[PDB]
């Protein structure tokens, strides 16, 4: 669409792949204001608005928050507050032809500066002079919209650029627009930090005999923490068991009698004892021994 009559498309109830936009080549500028330009793709927004227009490169620098320009004042206005990404890619190949292209046009003259996110499509003759235009061309009166001239020979500064502005709004609403995750892979019988559909815990994951109802997602524990989970990709119940924990007790005779000590790890099998994250290996540091032969369960 032409810049003065910029076209707004509402994006909702879908997962937004911003990373594909990042991957896509020929994007001359990808500037995100307020929102982080990368790693905030996952963040959920109530609605996403895409505003589409064709403008010159100088006008492309003009379209930013808190910037004064003719295109800013009389065609498309960007508020300082909004969090959004402005994307521009060079369109010389398809937006230009011989003898100029009249398809894209901009408003030279407007009575007042445009309010943010407001489009004016009025074609009424601009009354710069005190005398009224009367709806016809007159002295001091000119048509509001002047057609852009786009040519293949035309320099890069004057070359047409296609710009899509993405506006993100957060409100008291479901925020269906979001960004998906890679989702990694299932790890079983190993202590791990697990996120299942936004539920976070640290525990060993094992196959679960119990069968949930189809709608049901997670098991119940007294703390309200999960005792079981259902994997989202494959509907298999997984038991959650805590990673091994216990107290460490030093059994020591009196220091006057001896400096020899024994250590009793609590409620742990001796197989887990070597991985006790002792700072030094083969030396009796923090723990009396981990590979010692005097081991009694």
């Amino acid at each position, epitope marked *: 669409a032409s810049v003065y009559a910029w076209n707004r498309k509402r994006i909702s109830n879908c997962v937004a792949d911003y990373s594909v936009l990042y991957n896509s080549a020929s994007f001359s500028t990808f500037k995100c204001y307020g929102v982080s330009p990368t790693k905030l793709n996952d963040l959920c927004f109530t609605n996403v608005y895409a505003d589409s227009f064709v403008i010159r490169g100088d006008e492309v620098r003009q379209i930013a928050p808190g910037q004064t320009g003719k295109i800013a004042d009389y065609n498309y206005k960007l508020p300082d507050d909004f969090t959004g990404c402005v994307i521009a890619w060079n369109s*010389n*190949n*398809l937006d*230009s*032809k*011989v*003898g*100029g*292209n*009249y*398809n894209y046009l901009y408003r030279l003259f407007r009575k007042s500066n445009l309010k943010p996110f407001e489009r004016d499509i009025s074609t009424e003759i601009y009354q710069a002079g005190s005398t009224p235009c009367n709806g016809v061309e007159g002295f001091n009166c000119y048509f509001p919209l002047q057609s852009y001239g786009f040519q*293949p*020979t035309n320099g890069v500064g004057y070359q047409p650029y296609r710009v899509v502005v993405l506006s993100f709004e957060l409100l008291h609403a479901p925020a269906t627009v979001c960004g998906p995750k890679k989702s990694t892979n299932l790890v079983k019988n190993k202590c791990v930090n697990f996120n299942f559909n936004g539920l976070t815990g640290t525990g060993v994951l094992t196959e679960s005999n119990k069968k949930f109802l189809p709608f049901q997602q997670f098991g119940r524990d007294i703390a309200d923490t999960t005792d079981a989970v259902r994997d989202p990709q494959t509907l298999e119940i997984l038991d959650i068991t805590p990673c091994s924990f216990g107290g460490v007790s030093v059994i020591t005779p009196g220091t006057n009698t001896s400096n020899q000590v024994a250590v009793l790890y609590q409620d742990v099998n001796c197989t887990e004892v070597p991985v006790a994250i002792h700072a030094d290996q083969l030396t009796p540091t923090w723990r009396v021994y981990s590979t010692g032969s005097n081991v009694f369960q």
Partner: antibody
Amino acid sequence: EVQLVESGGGLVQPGGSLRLSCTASGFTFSNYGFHWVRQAPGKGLEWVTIISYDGITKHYADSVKDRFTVSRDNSKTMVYLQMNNLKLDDTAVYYCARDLGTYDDSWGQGVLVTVS
Amino acid sequence: DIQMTQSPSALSASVGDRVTISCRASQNIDGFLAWYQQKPGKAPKLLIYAASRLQSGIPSRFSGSGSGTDFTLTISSLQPEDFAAYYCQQVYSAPLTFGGGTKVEF
């Protein structure tokens, strides 16, 4: 839909003045720039002339320059390719195409022009 | 101006056979080229605009490739409708000379 129709092409004597008509329907003629093309028999296409959307600015092919003229009327929605000092080489089927080389491009059916 | 020519001397292949045509410019025209297909006694039909992106109302089999001076169009499968003359023009210069063209044939 965009429909382009051509007329005014017929057998002409060498050196005669022959003027073509490019019909426009189904689109805003004034907004879109217009182009004129010809294809000689058993030859590739040859672009003759272009006219701007307002008709203020015109360019002509080097071979046909100063002998072939182009005019248009916004009210009548027709582009006219006047041809003068016509030659046997000039003989071609003249296709009038709007917005050439773009997505907007449309091609007219064309009218045969013969110089013999 | 930038004079357009066509690389293949001849073009005949049976229905259902992938075919390839080539169009190289004399000077660098960047992405300013349009592919065309003209049937006998018919208006030319612009297969590709900008020479890399398919025109609306054109079958998916036709493809746009190449960048700069070099340009190529590939048809995945042939059909009776497909057989026709083909042409390439450059919009980068105000003087315009089309591509010579070749007649794909059965």
